[PDB]
Amino acid sequence: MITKVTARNNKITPVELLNQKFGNKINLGNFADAVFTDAAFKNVAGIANLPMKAPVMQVLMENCIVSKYLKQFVPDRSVCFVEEGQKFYIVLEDGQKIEVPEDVNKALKATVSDVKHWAGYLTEDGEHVIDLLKPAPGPHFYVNLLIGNRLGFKRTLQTTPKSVVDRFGRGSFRSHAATQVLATRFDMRQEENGFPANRQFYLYEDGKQIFYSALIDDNIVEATCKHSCNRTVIKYKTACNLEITRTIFLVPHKKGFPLATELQRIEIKNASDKARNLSITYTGMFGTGAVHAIFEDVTYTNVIMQSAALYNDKGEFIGITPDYYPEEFKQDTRFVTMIVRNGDEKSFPQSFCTDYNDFVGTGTLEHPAGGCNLNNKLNRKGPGFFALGAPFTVEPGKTVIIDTFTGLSSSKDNENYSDAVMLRELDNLLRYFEKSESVEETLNEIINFHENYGKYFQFNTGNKLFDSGFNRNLAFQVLYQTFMSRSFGQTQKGYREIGFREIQDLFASMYYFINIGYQDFVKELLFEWTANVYKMGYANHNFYWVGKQPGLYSDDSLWLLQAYYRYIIYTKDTSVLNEEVPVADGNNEKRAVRETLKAIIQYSACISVGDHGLPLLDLADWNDCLKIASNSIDGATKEKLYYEQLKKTYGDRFMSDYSESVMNAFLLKLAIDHLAEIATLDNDTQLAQQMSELSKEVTDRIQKHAWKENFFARVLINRYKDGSYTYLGAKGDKLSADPNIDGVYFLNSFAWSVLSDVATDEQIAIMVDVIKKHLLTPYGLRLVTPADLNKITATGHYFFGDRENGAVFKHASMMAVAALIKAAKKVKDNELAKEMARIAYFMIDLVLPYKNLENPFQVAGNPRICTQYINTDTGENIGPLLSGTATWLNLNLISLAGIEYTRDGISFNPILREEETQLNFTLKAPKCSYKFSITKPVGFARMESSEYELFVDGQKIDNTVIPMYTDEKEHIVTLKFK
Amino acid sequence: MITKVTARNNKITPVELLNQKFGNKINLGNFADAVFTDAAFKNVAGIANLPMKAPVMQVLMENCIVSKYLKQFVPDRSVCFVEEGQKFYIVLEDGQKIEVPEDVNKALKATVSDVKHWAGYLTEDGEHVIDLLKPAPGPHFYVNLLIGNRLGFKRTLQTTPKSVVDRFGRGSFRSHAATQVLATRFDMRQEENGFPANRQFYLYEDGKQIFYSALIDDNIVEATCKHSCNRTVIKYKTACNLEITRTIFLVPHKKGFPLATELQRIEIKNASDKARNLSITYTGMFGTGAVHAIFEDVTYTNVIMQSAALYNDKGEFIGITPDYYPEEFKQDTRFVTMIVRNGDEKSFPQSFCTDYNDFVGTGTLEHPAGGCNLNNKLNRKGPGFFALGAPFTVEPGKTVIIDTFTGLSSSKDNENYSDAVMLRELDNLLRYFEKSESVEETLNEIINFHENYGKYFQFNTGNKLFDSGFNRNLAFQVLYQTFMSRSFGQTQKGYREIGFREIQDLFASMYYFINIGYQDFVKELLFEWTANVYKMGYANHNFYWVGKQPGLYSDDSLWLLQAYYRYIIYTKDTSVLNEEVPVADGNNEKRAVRETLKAIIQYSACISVGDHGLPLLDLADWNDCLKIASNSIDGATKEKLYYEQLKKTNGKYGDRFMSDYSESVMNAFLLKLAIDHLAEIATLDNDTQLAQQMSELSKEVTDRIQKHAWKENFFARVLINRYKDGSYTYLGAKGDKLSADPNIDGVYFLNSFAWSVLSDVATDEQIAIMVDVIKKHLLTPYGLRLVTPADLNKIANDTATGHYFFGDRENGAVFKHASMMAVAALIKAAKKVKDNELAKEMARIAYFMIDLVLPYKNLENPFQVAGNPRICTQYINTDTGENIGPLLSGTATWLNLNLISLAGIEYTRDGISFNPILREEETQLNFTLKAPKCSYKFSITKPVGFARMESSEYELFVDGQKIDNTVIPMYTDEKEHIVTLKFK
Ligand SMILES: [Cl-]
Ligand SMILES: [Cl-]
Ligand SMILES: [Cl-]
Ligand SMILES: [Cl-]
Ligand SMILES: [Cl-]
Ligand SMILES: [Cl-]
């Protein structure tokens, strides 16, 4: 009787209906916008010929003049606005073209003025300038990510502060782990990361509110946000002629500082001919220490704390701290302080509120009723809401500066901890920043540290958006992910530990740290990860202060050999192999890095193998949503069963019918090759020979049992005596959920068969054909083809296009691009190479953040930060902002530029775009420098198949391995393809 | 170097500083208010002579005129406003008394106008009338609780809908368990139970916003909320002369209805001389099915759903449902519909929005930029925000009615479930409510069901606030807690299962249900609880669809005998004992109720006992924050160890389970009572052998307690057996050596006293002694606290620290539930003890404690005491006197029992044992009492002073026959019986 129509099942869209109605009467262009005028969807109001997709109608319908005019026609008639000439006209299905009245025309003209830049634009330095009134392409588009700096201090990974900042400065701020300084919000909308008050302030004049930092009213004439590397600057101009600048950054750690401090500087310039007496109220919400109790017992979170006030030596109020009763929430101590700088004079706040209800009173957060006159009452309960007040006079043409310091001290950086330690550290912070210029100097330390950091690799091309995008923005993101893994962002808000696997981030950032003198830090990290390997060779799946989930996932330890291979090959520092690092098993057991690397290979090569001598899948490997195994087991559980098996009968096979992971075999084969080269370089001929032979034995196992006519299988299945299911991931697996596709195909089977150097040239060609047929979509390379794994009872969680139901997972797509690039350099068939390169560049174009500003309202994403996946139904780039995408994009762009590090130096083999005639970049090495220049005619060119000349400091060279020089001089490398 | 000053400090308060400065210069009256004018606390601005405590200064400082005036004096100098005549003056420390300017005087006069009623007031019917501008005494004060009605349908406990509504209609709404219909919010503030948009709407005129249901602006002239039993009515009058009425209630279940529906009716009357063309936009946020993912993965919650639109037979849009991909979130289906009634004609909404960002756009939720012209775009993603729009014209003097229906259908009430079932059920709902008067009729069904429900017991005294407070409000709360246990309220928002123990609620509500013909329902509940007892006699600690945590807590099964004793004694229905109910062990095993009650007693009396033959404490008993035991065990774990012990011993089932585990004295009292109960039941069932057996076992247990648990001062709480040392022997009396207060020898638990008397173990000499101890150490100016300070770290495995500041919860609060159990004991003793002076004193303490718990009294001094004037709260902070939530606790249940006990009603085998204990100042008490097959009118008169039947001269008559013993039979002649008691 009643009918249901879903958003996806709805037939025509508004724009398609507009075309059906007006397509043969006016030129609609190729972009238009429209909305249905009624709940039944029979008519549309639209606007024609836009320069790109944009929600123009929704911005128009905010205008009162325009909605009144349309009301004469809508909802009972369809309509389209057209600028046919330079006046606007309204057009009806009945042919009429009516000139709209002058005020409607003024408003339409103004609305459609700057549509090309509604999502903002990028400066030449890669910074995102955003208008605060314009709509958002999506919830991650207008977001920036900040990070502190604890390099050279205790426990860098675990103690580096981090925050998220949107275009109005909203969001939140953390110290160690998921410790909240400013309150995170866990609610319905992705846009709401923080409690709304966080970082916001009000200005008053004569008892009247005239400004709120997060409300654009008629008093605001200009309002812009600029997101840069590790700071955000938000600028306003009011009609009363004030110029307000908010600058937000995290303080780099110094001796004696709190573990975490966020600095917001507020500059207020009076651009008028008269002095003005104003007051500022600065607001925010401290995070609770009892995060779980937010869901389970909110009253608890409130009663366990009370507000407290801070006073200096002269009895002057300076700030607020939330005081906790339970000892478990007393190991961190939060604070907020404000300094008002009026020329010479510095002063502190004169009033405060610590109760949200008294502050808002009868009004709202945008217009609080108790916001000017603060009651100075310390709240006996939480939550830790604060409001700090101060009056001040700004003389004509002059500026007053308000510096706020918000932060946390912690036992994690201090022995014998109490709140006394916070008080000392806060004093150190405030003394260090007594001078006004002290803040500008630190901001410039930050800017310069990051500019310096990126100089490991600089592109210098005819495209400043790409250059700045890689040279600054991507460099920063790969730094960020080295410290933060996947643990914090706009929509990453829950507690996450560091994934053993996510040592991948170090694959890219390594070279950056080494080249600004932090080689010991990279060493530190290798060792921290190495301490999470058990004697038997498996790894803790996660660790933070301490490791957990021992050998839960089969792949983890294998990643470590790539990290070490990368470090040792680059620095030649073999001494790392003799280091005695704790084993994850505990006691006080230590083991030489060398013997650990041998144990990891032995676990996957000899012990935890299946019927075909390939590594066991266990619960799962890299692919987390591939859960099959009938009664998988831990590494600890396996260890105990392994030793009983040995009694009932070290290094022999653990017997079982468990499935085998082909991906792991590829990781293993690569790991072994890596160890061989390492041994050779370490002058250990026996280990090098042993591993070299083991590499051949594993290659033959894969080639014989995993190549399935079409593709490398993903999983080998051994538990059906039946022979009913034998493998998954190639033709004849009998597991497809698409009738048009025989078999299931995983992108990583291809990617790792090439990255491990197992696939022959004929097999690569074959797999590339399959990929073009079935994994390549108009939005890139999807992870897997549709599968029916129920045959070995879980249903899907996602509509088509999202995540595991057919998305382009950009991290996996970049691992596949790495394989394509590697193959394009080596395969004999130049035509195959050309095509693999085309695919690589096609996929890179879909991932480069800056390109999200071409068609931002369809593609969304974030123009400075890589996002996780592309919805294959809409093309939208979907968060989170932290993923393996940035790491592998970085590696890939450097690979395309031709840089690969080997034992004898740099193997130089660039693959440029067909249309490029020139590529230039600079490269730092620890004890030298390089300038590279590559020229070629239009068309596909590579060293394996084109004529070329290579010069190093003007001397023609036949050897394409360029040595790592140590003379501290800049070396000119020139490559001319004929 | 830097100094820290917490909110808890010994510094002078603002009011005390005001007194120090102005006390000898102006009359400050009895009450004043003040605030510090600066962050250093050196000066105050205040106002003198208020009729009660109130945040008058804070309300004044909202006024722009007044804060400007004060700025001439503050912050550098102190000040006090004083009214002299009809003019206001400002007074300085330097004596000057300055007349304030006329606009400041206008504003001060208006502010201080109605200060006595700033927290609202109660109608004679016990309804709370609240002004929407005035401040809140606390986060639970302005809150109402609503409930559906699934009586006579499947699984009543688990399927009854419930919602919470504050004075602006904010909050949320649930179906089964913690299934959200409208979205709950889990954030920093206790005031924020729901997503802000829930239940709110906007009115437009000529494309201009003129009204928002949750914003009081200059256009609003009056704005009032009325909270009644199971509905809330919110009224507004605008300056443009509209009268808006919002009525909110939950729909009682009917055949074919959705499992949960909330109805909000919006009436808009044009009180002007011209027609007006308006439109309404009705908003809200559907709850997600993926609650955990709100913390763990918010993007997930968004992508797993999309919006969908609903259309009737004529292709007319009627509403929105959120459509889910994953099967796990497709077993419930939510909807929202709106009907606009303009006289005879009904119409449906003409537009919608399902995207919060498009709706708010450039503005805010209070003033949305996209709120008038809705884009009609179905959102491909969540969250399930909705906005429904409709234009309408209201003629002069006429009213239009907008009915909204929000709800959920579920597989939990339907086999072979799909969203098609929702569509059918929604159609049944909309057909049933086609006629305008259909809504008023259902509201009246609700009003009348509750008025009828309360007629089990009606007080008719010279105090309407007390009468309505007990007769309607408390009746309702005890109903609510029978269905909801402790699972939902303003600040109870997480998932909670039903505690075996919380069958206590049925102790009070039982009689109410029976007396409106729902005796089977009470029977159903007894049986549902009985199915969670295992063969061996222990119980699942929690159950919802299914039971869990088998014999985790030692007390649970013991409560069941009180429920049955209460049912059987009242109805005489012994047939319940032959009923075959499933055992919690599963298979298809059933057992007779009779043998289960025997198994419970055997478990605690014979099997799970310690060295002194008293029941084991195990992990814990009633007191959850009493965790000690070195390596406690489950009942299932115990069972398995018990059967191997019997093998390695040649034992007989029923022998003792051997261990050094501690014993619970509270459980011994529960046991002793349980056994007495079983004896009386057997006697009534004509089972003379069981009755004799239990009577003897009651004596044997009484001697064990009396010999091993009485410790010169008090009954111990716990007996400790694991120290060969003899280093610690007991906890809960003098010489236990476990006090954390140097001034107190020993630790004293309120429940040791309470249950020693409720079980009838304590002698008269022991009661006198314990009452002395209680007056010394447990009685505070804010009532009876649960326990005295203890140092349990000496005997626990842990090294636990406290979580609470002094006064809150386990650090010294008055837990009102425990205080009401102690008052029950005081009342029982006051009736029986030989010493009349002791009785008099116990009765004073009882009434003193009841006065601190009666909700209506929270409106005397509301801004210190807070609470809620219609609903009992959980505890009183012993530092401030504030009544703190949640709104659901054992307090209401035991308050109900206690007030009925004081009125003199106790049910026994021979009928009603009538022994009233009136207040000293009362000269008269009247009430009516329903019984299943008769009725009673009671009248009691006495002179001023303490009076009781054990020690005063009196006459007692029944219709006109003198009674000499206290017993009034339960008549069955369907007539009203007049009972008169005259104390001389
Ligand atoms: Cl994969
Ligand atoms: Cl994110
Ligand atoms: Cl990822
Ligand atoms: Cl207790
Ligand atoms: Cl509550
Ligand atoms: Cl309780």
CA A266 from chain center: how many Å? 28
Contacts of A325 in chain B (CB under 8 A): 802-805
DSSP codes of every residue in A661-693: EHHHHHHHHHHHHHHHHHHHHTT-HHHHHHHHH
DSSP codes of every residue in B287-346: PPS-THHHHH-HHHHHHTEEEEEEE-TTS-EEEEEEEESSGGGSSEEEEEEEEEEETTEE
CB contact under 8 A, B207 and A64: yes
Using DSSP's 3-state secondary structure scheme, residue B9 falls into coil
CB contact under 8 A, A304 and B804: yes
PDB experimental method:
X-ray
Mutate which: A2, A118, A425, vs B, most B CBs within 10 A: A2
- Residue A650 token pair: 């070290």
Minimum distance, in Å, between the CA of residue B803 and any CA atom of chain A: 5
Dihedral sign, Cα of residue A529, residue A532, residue A534, residue A538:
negative
DSSP codes of every residue in B353-372: E--HHHHHTTS-SSS-TTSS
Using DSSP's 3-state secondary structure scheme, residue A951 falls into strand
**Considering every ligand atom, which ligand is closest to the CA of B731?**
4
CB contact under 8 A, B372 and A67: yes
Mutate which: A71, A185, A187, A311, vs B, most B CBs within 10 A: A187
Distance, CA A180 to ligand 2 centroid (Å)? 16
CB contact under 8 A, A380 and B7: yes
Beta bridge partners of A306: A323
* Cα separation values, B809 from A126, A290, A656, B804, Å: 55, 17, 55, 7
Beta bridge partners of A244: A236, A268
Residues A313 and A68: their CA atoms lie apart, in Å, by: 63
DSSP codes of every residue in A484-541: HTTS-SSS--S--PEEGGGGHHHHHHHHHHHTTT-HHHHHHHHHHHHTTB-TTS-BEE
DSSP codes of every residue in A367-381: S-TTSSS---PPPSS
Long-range own/partner contacts, residues A684-687 (CB < 8 A, 24 or more apart): A687/A598
CB contact under 8 A, A133 and B362: yes
**Considering every ligand atom, which ligand is closest to the CA of B810?**
4
Mutate which: A8, A37, A58, A497, vs B, most B CBs within 10 A: A58
Q: Which amino acid is at A604?
A: S
Q: What is the DSSP letter of A607?
A: I
Asked whether A393 and A343 are in contact (CB, 8 A), the reply is no
DSSP element (H, E) containing B681: helix B665-684
Residues A382 and A375: their CA atoms lie apart, in Å, by: 16
Return left, alpha or beta for B513; rule: phi > 0 is left, psi -120 to 50 is alpha, else beta. alpha
Residue B404 has phi, psi (to 5 degrees) of -115, 145
CB contact under 8 A, B61 and A370: yes
Using DSSP's 3-state secondary structure scheme, residue B592 falls into strand
Place of tokens 């919060």: B356
Asked whether B454 and B512 are in contact (CB, 8 A), the reply is yes
Q: What is the DSSP letter of A655?
A: P
DSSP element (H, E) containing B896: helix B890-902
Helices (H) and strands (E) in chain A, counts: 25, 48
Residues B689 and B484: their CA atoms lie apart, in Å, by: 40
Contacts of A296 in chain B (CB under 8 A): 494
Residues B613 and B663: their CA atoms lie apart, in Å, by: 8
Distance, CA A802 to ligand 1 centroid (Å)? 16
Chain A residue at shortest CA distance from B312: A2
CB contact under 8 A, A799 and B424: no
Other residues' Cβ atoms within 10 Å of the Cβ of residue B437: 9
Q: Which resolution, in Å, applies to this structure?
A: 2.3
Contacts of A349 in chain B (CB under 8 A): 39
Asked whether A214 and A169 are in contact (CB, 8 A), the reply is yes
Beta strands in A498-642 (DSSP E): 498-499, 540-543, 547-550, 580-582, 590-592
Residue (of B502, B526, B503, B544) closest to B581 by Cα position? B526
DSSP element (H, E) containing B682: helix B665-684
CB contact under 8 A, A419 and B351: no
Instruction: Select A121-453's CATH number: 2.70.98.40, 3.40.640.10, 3.40.50.150, 3.40.30.10.
Output: 2.70.98.40
Residue B40 has phi, psi (to 5 degrees) of -90, -10
Burial class (CB in 10 A: 0-12, 13-18, 19+), A251: buried
Residues A455 and A452: their CA atoms lie apart, in Å, by: 6
CA A889 from chain center: how many Å? 12
Residues B15 and B36: their CA atoms lie apart, in Å, by: 9
Return left, alpha or beta for A38; rule: phi > 0 is left, psi -120 to 50 is alpha, else beta. beta
Dihedral sign, Cα of residue A622, residue A628, residue A634, residue A639:
negative
CB contact under 8 A, B39 and A350: yes
Residues B255 and B425: their CA atoms lie apart, in Å, by: 9
Asked whether B406 and B339 are in contact (CB, 8 A), the reply is no
Asked whether A733 and A744 are in contact (CB, 8 A), the reply is yes
- Residue B560 token pair: 């069941």
Residue (of A719, A724, A702) closest to A711 by Cα position? A702
Residues A450 and A453: their CA atoms lie apart, in Å, by: 5
Asked whether B62 and B84 are in contact (CB, 8 A), the reply is no
Closest Cβ–Cβ partner in B38, B188, B309 for A285: B188
Minimum distance, in Å, between the CA of residue B579 and any CA atom of chain A: 39
Residue (of B119, B117, B174, B115) closest to B142 by Cα position? B119
Residues B348 and B361: their CA atoms lie apart, in Å, by: 25
Residues B199 and B264: their CA atoms lie apart, in Å, by: 8
Residues B757 and B833: their CA atoms lie apart, in Å, by: 11
DSSP element (H, E) containing A129: strand A128-131
Q: Give the pairing type, strands B79-84 and B961-963.
A: unpaired
CB contact under 8 A, B304 and A183: no
Residue (of A852, A778, A854) closest to A31 by Cα position? A854
Chain A residue at shortest CA distance from B4: A310
Residues A925 and A570: their CA atoms lie apart, in Å, by: 9
Burial class (CB in 10 A: 0-12, 13-18, 19+), A463: exposed
Q: Which amino acid is at A532?
A: N
Q: Give the pairing type, strands B144-147 and B162-165.
A: antiparallel
Distance, CA A305 to ligand 5 centroid (Å)? 20
Distance, CA A492 to ligand 2 centroid (Å)? 5
Q: What is the DSSP letter of A875?
A: -
Distance, CA B484 to ligand 6 centroid (Å)? 13
What burial letters (b/e) apply to B623-653, b meaning 16+ CB within 10 Å? beebebbeebbbbbebbeebeebeeeeeeee
**Considering every ligand atom, which ligand is closest to the CA of A861?**
2
Q: Give the pairing type, strands A260-270 and A180-182.
A: unpaired
CB contact under 8 A, A61 and B373: yes
Contacts of B5 in chain A (CB under 8 A): 308-309, 311, 378
Residues A493 and A486: their CA atoms lie apart, in Å, by: 10
Helices (H) and strands (E) in chain B, counts: 25, 48
DSSP element (H, E) containing A889: helix A884-897
Contacts of B35 in chain A (CB under 8 A): 375-377
CA angle (B343 as vertex; B337, B349 as ends), nearest 5? 25
Asked whether B35 and B45 are in contact (CB, 8 A), the reply is yes
Contacts of B351 in chain A (CB under 8 A): 38-39, 75
Closest Cβ–Cβ partner in A2, A35, A372 for B426: A2
**Considering every ligand atom, which ligand is closest to the CA of B750?**
4
DSSP element (H, E) containing B566: helix B556-571
Beta strands in A574-697 (DSSP E): 580-582, 590-592, 660-661
Minimum distance, in Å, between the CA of residue B546 and any CA atom of chain A: 21
How crowded is the C-beta side of A542, counted as CA atoms within 13 Å? 9
Residue (of B493, B479, B496) closest to B885 by Cα position? B493
Residues A781 and A768: their CA atoms lie apart, in Å, by: 12
Place of tokens 């299931």: A744
Residues A55 and A30: their CA atoms lie apart, in Å, by: 15
Using DSSP's 3-state secondary structure scheme, residue B421 falls into helix
CB contact under 8 A, A323 and B41: no
As a whole number of Å, the end-to-end CA separation of chain A is 74
CB contact under 8 A, A188 and B187: no
Distance, CA A823 to ligand 3 centroid (Å)? 24
Who contacts B806 (Cβ-Cβ below 8 Å, separation ≥6)? B812, B878, B879
Cis before A383 (ω within 30): yes
Closest Cβ–Cβ partner in B295, B304, B317 for A186: B295
Other residues' Cβ atoms within 10 Å of the Cβ of residue A765: 17
**Considering every ligand atom, which ligand is closest to the CA of B138?**
5
Contacts of A383 in chain B (CB under 8 A): 188-189
Beta strands in A325-376 (DSSP E): 332-342, 345-347, 351-353
Distance, CA A748 to ligand 1 centroid (Å)? 5
Give the strands of the sheet with A877-878, arranged side by side.
A808-809, A869-870, A877-878
Residue B48 has phi, psi (to 5 degrees) of -95, 160
Chain A residue at shortest CA distance from B425: A2
Using DSSP's 3-state secondary structure scheme, residue A21 falls into helix
Chain B residue at shortest CA distance from A287: B188
Between chain A and chain B, how many beta carbons pairs sit less than 8 Å apart? 317
Length of chain A, please? 978
* Cα separation values, B548 from B499, B544, B662, Å: 10, 9, 24
Beta strands in B783-863 (DSSP E): 783-784, 814-815
Asked whether A423 and B1 are in contact (CB, 8 A), the reply is yes
Residues B314 and B335: their CA atoms lie apart, in Å, by: 19
Q: What is the DSSP letter of B657?
A: P
Q: Give the pairing type, strands A869-870 and A877-878.
A: antiparallel
Distance, CA A295 to ligand 4 centroid (Å)? 27
Residues A795 and A789: their CA atoms lie apart, in Å, by: 10
